[PDB]
Recover the amino acids of this structure.
């Protein structure tokens, strides 16, 4: 590093109409699979969360 | 158990810049290293027989 | 006397449990919060009985 | 005793260039961008296609 | 709180004139307040940055004139 | 205070259901809170930054989960 | 008596902090015990050899752990 204090960006692919939101799931995540129906039924209806 | 971990870190460029009494600061010496040079000594022992 | 300046950094995405990072601007200097036992790239295993 | 000072090691104070000392530097250089790579498909040999 | 960084200032009390001391004080200042106005030189300190206050008396983002009272209060000489 | 900027979110009370509403809510948010997490889309707002919050309800640097409950408060349905 | 040489050390007490002292201790050490183990640096002393010990507390050839505990004892802080 030639100048003090480097920096590195990070581009998250975030979905749900808010690239920044509270708990906006990340799109392409090695951990986390893509939400199975988001493009699909999950746009037509909203499913009850499980708790 | 991961309770007490093991690290090595730097020195903040605010502390390292003024080190051992610069800019009015005080009590903060640098660390130093010496060398020692200690010696050993041996002796010759005899041995012998007859006929 | 000698002087050096180096500084260390954590890979962005190191933790990689995180949906999206907090604050958008996040020190890459290692610390307790981000860098302790959370880095995905490295997995430490103590062996015993050798 | 003009001091160089440091960024506070805060993440903002670096990205702004704010510095405890005299100078406020430009910015945190750039070390380049880190994206999140795309996961791999399992393709379709496992399930008959029939377009 | 500060939400950015703290510049911790630790001053060492020195004997100045007859039966008098310049009181050594430990103080933690929010960094963007400390960078804007800080008076300390020749004050026999040692300063270190940190992300949470390392001393009891803490000066947040908003003091200014309250810290401008304290930053030059380090030269107040108690008998 | 935020000391940075206040992002002012103004939602317009609309009639959602029979004799019901989504109440019009005028709220200011500290920019470094708003830039980190903001849920606004399809919120029927108009948003302007300022150096001093423009509304009585104010969410400063430190709320987070108090705003994260209040950012999705803009879709609340009322009788 | 050590019969070889005696390294005579005189340490000069000082005010370390507010109403605190680092106790000055005059001491002497057998030259071999001194060359073997001596911890004195930054201790505000002055040291001279002599055929006999020139100070009250004298360490002959065999003390060791009495002096190894004593040489580091010069940094004990008293009020």
């Amino acid at each position: 590093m030639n100048s003090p204090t480097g920096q590195v960006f990070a581009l998250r692919a975030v979905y749900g109409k808010d690239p920044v939101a509270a708990g906006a799931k990340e799109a392409f995540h090695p951990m986390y699979g893509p939400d199975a129906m988001f493009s699909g039924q999950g746009a037509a209806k909203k499913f009850p969360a499980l708790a | 158990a991961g309770a007490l971990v093991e690290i090595a870190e730097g020195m903040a460029t605010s502390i390292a810049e003024l080190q051992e009494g610069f800019n009015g600061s005080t009590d903060n010496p640098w660390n130093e290293m010496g060398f020692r040079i200690d010696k050993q000594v041996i002796e010759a022992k005899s041995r012998q027989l007859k006929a | 006397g000698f002087k050096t300046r180096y500084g260390i950094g954590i890979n962005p995405f190191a933790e990689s449990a995180a949906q999206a990072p907090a604050s958008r601007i996040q020190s890459g200097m290692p610390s307790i919060l981000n860098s302790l036992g959370k880095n995905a790239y490295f997995r430490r295993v103590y062996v015993k009985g050798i | 005793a003009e001091i160089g000072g440091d960024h506070g090691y805060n993440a903002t104070n670096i990205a702004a260039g704010q510095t405890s000392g005299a100078v406020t530097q430009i910015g945190p250089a750039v070390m380049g961008m880190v994206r999140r790579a795309i996961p791999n498909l399992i393709a379709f040999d496992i399930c008959g296609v029939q377009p | 709180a500060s939400a950015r960084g703290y510049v911790n200032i630790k001053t060492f009390e020195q004997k100045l004139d007859g039966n008098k001391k310049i009181e050594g004080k430990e103080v933690s200042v929010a960094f963007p307040l400390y960078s804007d106005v800080h008076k300390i030189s020749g004050a026999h300190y040692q300063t270190f940055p940190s992300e949470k206050a390392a001393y009891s008396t803490v000066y947040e983002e908003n003091q200014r004139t309250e810290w401008i009272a304290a930053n030059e209060d380090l030269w107040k000489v108690t008998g």
User: Anything to note?
Assistant: The CA atoms of residues 13 and 42 of chain C lie 13 Å apart.
